[PDB]
Amino acid sequence: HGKSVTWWDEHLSEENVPFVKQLVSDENKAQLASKLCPLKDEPWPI
Amino acid sequence: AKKGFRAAYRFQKELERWRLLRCPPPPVRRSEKPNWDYHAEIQAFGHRLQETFSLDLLKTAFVNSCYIKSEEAKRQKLGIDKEAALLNLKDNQELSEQGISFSQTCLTQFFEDAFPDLPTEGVTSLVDFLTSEEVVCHVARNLAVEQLALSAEFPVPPPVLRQTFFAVIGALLQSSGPERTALFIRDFLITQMTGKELFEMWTITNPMGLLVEELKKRKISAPESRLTRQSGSTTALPVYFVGLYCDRKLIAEGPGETVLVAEEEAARVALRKLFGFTENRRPWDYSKP
Amino acid sequence: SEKEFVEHARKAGLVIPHERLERPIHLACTAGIFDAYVPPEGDARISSLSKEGLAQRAERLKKNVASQLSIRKIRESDPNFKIKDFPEKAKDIFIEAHLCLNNSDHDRLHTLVTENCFPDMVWDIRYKTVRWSFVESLEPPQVVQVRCSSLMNQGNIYGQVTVRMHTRQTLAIYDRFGRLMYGQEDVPRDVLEYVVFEKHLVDPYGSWRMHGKIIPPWAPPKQPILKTVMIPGPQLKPWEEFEEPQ
Amino acid sequence: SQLSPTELIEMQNDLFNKEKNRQLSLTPRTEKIEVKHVGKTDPGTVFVMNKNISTPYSCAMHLSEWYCRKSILALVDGQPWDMYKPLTKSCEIKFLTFKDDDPGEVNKAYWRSCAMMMGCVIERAFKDEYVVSLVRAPEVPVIAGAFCYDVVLDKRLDEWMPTKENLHSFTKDARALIYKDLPFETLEVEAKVALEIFQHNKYKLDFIEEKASQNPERIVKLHRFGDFIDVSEGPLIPRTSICFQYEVSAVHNLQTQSSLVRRFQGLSLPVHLRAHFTIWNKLLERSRKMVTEDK
Amino acid sequence: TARGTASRFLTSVLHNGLGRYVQQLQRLSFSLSRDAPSSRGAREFVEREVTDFARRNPGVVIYVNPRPCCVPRVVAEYLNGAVREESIHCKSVEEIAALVQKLADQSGLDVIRIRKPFHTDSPSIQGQWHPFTNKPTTLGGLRPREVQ
Amino acid sequence: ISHGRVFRRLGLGPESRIHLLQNLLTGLVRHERIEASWARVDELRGYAEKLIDYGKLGDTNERAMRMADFWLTEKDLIPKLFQVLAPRFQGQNGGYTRMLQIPNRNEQDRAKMAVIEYKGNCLPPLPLPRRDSNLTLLNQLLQGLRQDQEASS
Amino acid sequence: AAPKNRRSIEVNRCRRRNPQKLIKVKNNIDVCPECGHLKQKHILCGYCYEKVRKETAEIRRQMGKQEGGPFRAPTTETVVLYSGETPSEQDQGKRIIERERKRPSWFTQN
Amino acid sequence: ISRKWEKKNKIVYPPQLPGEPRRPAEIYHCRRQIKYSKDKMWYLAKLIRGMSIDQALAQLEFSDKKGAQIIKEVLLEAQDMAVRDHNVEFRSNLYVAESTSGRGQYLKRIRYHGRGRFGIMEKVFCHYFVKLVEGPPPPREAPKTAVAHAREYIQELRNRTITHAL
RNA sequence: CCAGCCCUAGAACAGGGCACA
Ligand SMILES: [Mg+2]
Ligand SMILES: [Mg+2]
Ligand SMILES: [Mg+2]
Ligand SMILES: [Mg+2]
Ligand SMILES: [Zn+2]
Incomplete structure (x- = not known):
């Protein structure tokens, strides 16, 4: 089985690529917003 | 053009050797080979073991049912009447059965008188190992019994080889004495147990x-x-x-x-x-x- | 340094050396068949009756004046020519030719069959193993017609005899590797052909040699091949488009 | 009856083999069929195939290995067709891949194949003392984020649900099953023999009956790969190893007035359409939800 | 050169000599000529010493073949199936008898280097050395720095 | 060291490179689709974009007039440049050209060749590598994810 | 500089069989879904490009035959049409090329 | 010269008895007097050794060597021969068992250097031999694992014997 | 994970980027 190489743009569609970009972008934004207040969640003893 | 014949003939011998190395021919029958005399071979087989066989008994033991069937097939293919002498070959089945029985009995008795602590299954496994196809075939091939056995399929498969060997054993039993045959068995079958172990041939679980x-x-x-x-x-x-x-x-x-x-x-x-x-x-x- | 290659294989025949031959080409047989016998499409059912086939064959062989005059010319050219003793000899020649093709005896096959029958029966079989046999014959071979070609430029007469043969044969054509390719060796399948033997009458020896093998147009198709065959599509150029036939 | 699971597997395999031998002996001779290729790549191609012996997989082998690698489904002139199903008569064939313009049929076939694989894994990953019965393969469209399978467990297993460790174990079992290439064989049998083939699952018997009701000739499609036999609609993929990425998302216990059935959900992507890590995680998180579609 | 040639251990065919001795020489075939001056020694040997040797060794089939050949040869076929070919071309009767006695006393095995001049089956009588056959045991089998 | 550079060396030097790019740009303006070496086409892309930007700037702009006079060798292209290519590209901002790498040349050099083409030309469309249809498996799963995201809001 | 000794065949093989000099297998090969030929995933199909090149050569040959002068370039837009086609209202006012061959499948009307 | 790789294609085997396994078909082919170089052709031969005919042709289509088209033509001719002459169905069921490249008869020319010195320039020519076997491609040998290494090491430790002891 | 496109990274081979625009 000579499997070929595959990147993330090969199998996607014109209507799915921007959706994927937005779905990862807002995900990263929400993660950085949730990690924005570390002193109130569970800080280690200073 | 180098004048000469010695170099040419020696190079022909070299070419024959290279052809032999390249395409190995199947093993041909020692009897079919040029230098052969069946009666002389029988007498030599009788004299080399320091035994006194019977010529008729050996000629009866060294024939096989497969050989008889092959000769009958050749007769039917050729169209000659051969029922006068070919049907009187006296196949060695009875001699082989007698040899098998006597050899198994003598080996069992020897093991019982030698190792009194050997159980029944143990002595049975020992007898079956000493009378198995491998050991009997090795002994017969070293005694050149394969070359004197009249039978088709010159490879002489292990069953035919063992049947012929035990037919020779039965011929010895009928010709000479039981004690002499027992000494023959002790000298040509128990020697294969030298250095061997009990469990290597018992194979317990x-x-x-x-x-x-x-x-x-x-x-x-x-x-x-x-x-x-x-x-x-x-x-x-x-x-x-x-x-x-x-x-x-x-x-x-x-x-x-x-x-x-x-x-x-x-x-x-x-x-x-x-x-x-x-x-x-x-x-x-x-x-x- | 000035060294060049040689031995450039080329095949070019020219009319000047083709016509400048000192000796004309001696042919042992003719090129092809002049008068092809067209059998009626009712033989498949007529062969079911024994006498209703023999009577029709005898009548058709007797009433054809061309066959009668050809047989008379063969008789007057060479004595000891009998029509009744011909079918057995033809059957034996056919069986011997098949056995020779089985045994790969090319010299005997050349003695039996002619120069126009040998290639068509040796080309695609020279590298295959065949196991042919003869088991039975349902209908005896029936001499249908006799023709004669007389070329007067050289005074050469060649007589051809067509014989309908209904045989029961078993064919098993292997391949050069040893695997079975065409069919089984134990199926006695029936076949019905027309063997056209040819003999040169001016020749003093005159051995009867098989020349042609005619099959009826209504004959059943041959047995299927054990493998699968793929027919390639039409090789089209880039500036060409495909046209689907209807 | 007192029958070990291995004994049941052996009996099913033996009966399927007997039916297959009967189907093969139904035709004593090897007839020649003339198959046209109505595909887009090589038009006008003709194949001299064997009746009930040659397969569209053999047709792809005749064409080129690229077809054997790409083409998943076959369209025999009016309908889908798996690769390992023998041809019947002269027809025309068109191959169908995953990246085609109308790959809906191939997607549904891959869905059914993954559902059957998950069902086999669930059936053979549980203990012997417990009873486990596969109901059917719920035909959910491609828009649904997962393929589901209905399983009825023992009465004493209606309390616990498989945890993350159990889901990972199921996924490992599915991956090990995929590792060994298993061909999917499809056979056309009758309900009279399907009933005695199964003989144990009342749900499977009812499913066979309701599928043969709509069939005027009482014709049931059985599918079998390796040692497992199951009935499902539509053809299947030729090979198992085509399923590259495979996960068991979660399970949903639905209760009815008769009994409760575990609805196991799985996600899968072939080797031709494998996705990225984040894409696979998002699709698995979507498959984590509930899927409800019966009619 | 040991690395260039083969090697084998000192073995005996069918455990010869343990129960009874068996002459390993099965057949001995001479091929000579009647008029060739090179076959003088072979001719004189066949005239004089073949009968005494045949009487002394009954278990060997002795073949003699006068044929139109130039080099007198001797082929010894043994019980193991080995075929040893030697040339007796222009050799005196004493040398012929010496070669015949040599071929008779040989065992038929290959003439190559023998690694061990001895071969004893089960040489472990009364015990074989192992790294624990001479070390004293402690109370309870405790390791050097192990506390119980 | 070749850090922070945008122009690649071609021809026999700077002036030879300018002349080669000028000839390539003239051929491109004349034929609306040409093919050359991959590096030459990648270099010509920006010059063609700038030439279209200058052509859209109007006819009376003597700067763009003399720029086209220098670049377009065949003077029968300047009226064409100002009255065909520039007018048809008004709403488009930078999507004027299309470059695609073709298979290597059949000659023994086996060079990396590309084809550049002005959009909206009167030539058969190149076999552009298109995306997969929305009916594919992964595209359908992504459409389902998108529908779920839209229903969540 | 001169070599001091002849390099043996063992070292010769160890040098000219190293994976650094062996031709690597390219795994970006795919088939063209249109015509069924072979192409790479980042390169256009050779067969389709040859078809387009032949058609473009024919179109340019005809449009150059229409212009009997070397420096006679069209001052307006150009449109190519095939047999069985008539210029519409959006196609009027432009230069027109007429081809006897039918419009192929890949060529869109637009 | 010598011509045996072509004569190897004319051997005939005895018929296979009923019950024996099907022996795969073998097809030998060769291209003589190629203008390419011996080593440069051997590189492509080693590249396409052991691979399937389909993947070999796919690689040769994109290979930039001049011998790529040569070997592709040779493989196409060999496949056509195996399909037509030999009884080998499923034209894509072949794999390259052996693919070698040897030298042939060269030509000598004078290559001038200067100062009245010269060199014997050798116009090279190479023969390309190929063997196609009907059947699936053989699997690639995987690297030896730690378990196999440990087993072999334990076996080598156990196979020891007390040398010069008896 | 490395098809392809860039790099203040680089002979080749390597390394870092290609979602906010
Ligand atoms: Mg000078
Ligand atoms: Mg030199
Ligand atoms: Mg020199
Ligand atoms: Mg990187
Ligand atoms: Zn294409």
Whole structure:
């Protein structure tokens, strides 16, 4: 089985690529917003 | 053009040798080879073993039913009347059966009088190993019985080889005495047991179980497996020594890679010590009583 | 340094050396068949009756004046020529030719069959193993027609005899690797052909040699091949488009 | 009856083999069929195939290995067709891949194949003392984020649900099953023999009956790969190893007035359409939800 | 050169000599000529010493073939199936008898280097050395720095 | 060291490179689709974009007039440049050209060749590598994810 | 500089069989879904490009035959049409090329 | 010269008895007097050794060597021969068992250097031999695992014997 | 994970980027 190489743009569609970009972008934004207040969640003893 | 004939003939010999190395021909029959005389070969086979056979008995034993069938097929293919002499070959089935029976009985009796502690299954396995296809075929091939056996399929498959060997045994039994045939068997079959082990041909499955059964028979309570010495426990190749103690008395000890294999080896050693087949046993007496 | 290659294989025949031959080409047989016998499409059912086939064959062989005059010319050219003793000899020649093709005896096959029958029966079989046999014959071979070609430029007469043969044969054509390719060796399948033997009458020796093998147009198709065959599509150029036939 | 699971597997395999031998002996001779290739790549191609012996997989082998690698489904002139199903008569064939313009049929076939694989894994990953019965393969469209399978467990297993460790174990079992290439064989049988083939699952018997009701000739499609036999609609993929990425998302216990059935959900992507890590995680998180579609 | 040639251990065919001795020479075939001056020694040997040797060794089939050949040869076929070919071209009767006695006393095995001049089956009488056969045991089998 | 550079060396030097790019740009303006070496086409892309930007700037702009006079060798292209290519590209900002790498040349050089083409030309469309249809498996799963995201809001 | 000794065949093989000099297998090969030929995933199909090149050569040959002068370039837009086609209202006012061959499948009307 | 790789294609085997396994078909082919170089052709031969015919043709289509088209033509001719002459169905069921490249008869020319010195320039020519076997491609040998290494090492430790002991 | 496109990274081979625009 000579499997070929595959990147993330090969199998996607014109209507799915921007959706994927937005779905990862807002995900990263929400993660950085949730990690924005570390002193109130569970800080280690200073 | 280099004038000469010695170089040319020697190079022809070299080319023949290279052709032999390249395409090996199938083995041809020694009888079909040019230099051959059947009566002389029979007499030489009789005289080389320091025995006094019977010529008719040997000619009866060295024929095979497959050879008879092949000759009958050739007769039917050629169209000649051969029912006068070809049907009177006296196939060696009865001689082979007599040889098998006498050899098995004599080997069983020899093993019983030599090792009294050998169980029934043990002596049966020993007899079957000494009369198996491999040992009998090796002995016959070393005695050149294969070359004198009149039979098709010159490879002479192991069943035909063993049948012919035991037919020779039966011919010896009918010609000479039973004691002489027993000495022949002792000299040409028991020699294959020199240096061999009991379990290599017995091939038991539960040595510890057989050992505890033998101890129950010999009125011994139970063996205890104990670690005597060890060389490394976390190494990649551990070495353990497991000993068997009956009433706090060491009866056998075995080394191994793991504890289970070491205990199996200790059980095997204890079984051999109980049955008497030990490396320090009496050598087999090869003498003339 | 000035060294060049040689031995350039080329095949070019020219009319000047083709016509400048000192000796004309001696042919042992003719090129092809002049008068092809067209059998009626009712033989498949007529062969079911024994006498209703023999009577029709005898009548058709007797009433054809061309066959009668050809037989008379063969008789007057060479004595000891009988029509009744011909079918057995033809059957034996056919069986011997098949056995020779089985045994790969090319010299005997050349003695039996002619120069126009040998290639068509040796080309695609020279590298295959065949196991042919003869089991039975349902209908005896029936001499249908006799023709004669007389070329007067050289005074050469060649007589051809057509014989309908209904045989029961078993064919098993293997391949050069040893695997079975065409059919089984134990199936006695029936076949019905027309063997056209040819003999040169001016020749003093005159051995009867098989020349042609005619099959009826209504004959059943041959047995299927054990393998699967793929027919490639039309190789089209880039500036060409495909046209689907209807 | 007192029958071990291995004994049931052996009996099913033996009966399927007997039916297959009967189907093969139904035709004593090897007839020649003339198959046209109505595909887009090589038009006008003709194949001289064997009746009930040659397969569209053999047709792809005749064409080129690229077809054997790409083409998953076959369209025999009016309908889908798996690769390992023998041809019947002369027809025309068109191959169908995953990246085609109308790959809906191939997607549904891959869905059914993954559902059957998950069902086999669930059936053979549980203990012997417990009873486990596969109901059917719920035909959910491609828009649904997962393929589901209905399983009825023992009465004593209606309390616990498989945890993350159990889901990972199921996924490992599915991956090990995929590792060994298993061909999917499809056979056309009758309900009269399917009933005695199964003989144990009342739900499977009812499913066979309701599928043969709509069939005027009482024709049931059985599918079998390796040692497992199951009935499902539509053809299947030729090979198992085509399923590259495979996960068991979660399970949903639905209760009815008769009994409760575990609805196991799985996600899968072939080797031709494998996705990225984040894409696979998002699709698995979507498959984590509930899927409800019966009619 | 040991590395260039083969090697084998000192073995005996069919454990010869243990129960009874068997002459390993099965057949001995001479091929000579009647008029060639090179076959003088072979001719004189066949005249004089073949009968005494045949009487001394009954278990060997002795073949003699006068044929139009130039080099007198001797082929010894043994019980193991080995075929040893030697040339007796222009050799005196004493040398012929010496070669015949040599071929008779040979065992038929290959004439190559023998690694061990001895071969004893089970040489482990009374025990074989192992790294624990001479070290004393401690109370309970404790390791050097192990506390119980 | 070749850090922070945008122009690649071609021809026999700077002036030879300018002349080669000028000839390539003239051929491109004349034929609306040409093919050359991959590096030459990648270099010509920006010059063609700038030439279209200058042509859209109007006819009376003498700067763009003399720029086209220098670049377009065949003077029968300047009226074409100002009255065909520039007018048809008004709403488009930078999507004027299309460059695609073709298979290597059949000659023994085996060079990396590309084809550049002005959009909206009167030529058969190149076999552009298109995306997969929305009916594919992964595209359908992504459409389902998108529908779920839209229903969540 | 001169070599001091002849390099043996063992070292010769160890040098000219190293994976650094062996031709690597390219795994980006795919088939063209249109015509069924072979192409790479980042390169246009050779067969389709050859078809387009032949058609473009024919179109340019005809449009150059229409212009009997070398420096006679069209001042307006150009449109190519095939047999069985008529210029519409959006196609009027432009230069027109007429081809006897039918419009192929890949060429869109637009 | 020598011509045996072509004569190897004319051997005939005895018929296979009923019950024996099917022997796969073998097809030998060769191209003589190629203008390419011996080593440069051997590189492509080693590249396409052991691979399937389909993947070999796929690689040769994109290979930039001049011998790529040569070997592709040779493989196409060999496949056509195996399909037509030999009884080998499923034209894509072949794999390259052996693919070698040897030298042939060269030509000598004078290559001038200067100062009245010269060199014997050798116009090279190479023969390309190929063997196609009907059947699936053989699997690639995987690297030896740690378990196999440990087993072989334990076996080598166990196969020891007390040398010069008896 | 490395098809392809860039790099203040680089002979080749390597390394870092290609979602906010
Ligand atoms: Mg000078
Ligand atoms: Mg030189
Ligand atoms: Mg020199
Ligand atoms: Mg990188
Ligand atoms: Zn294409």
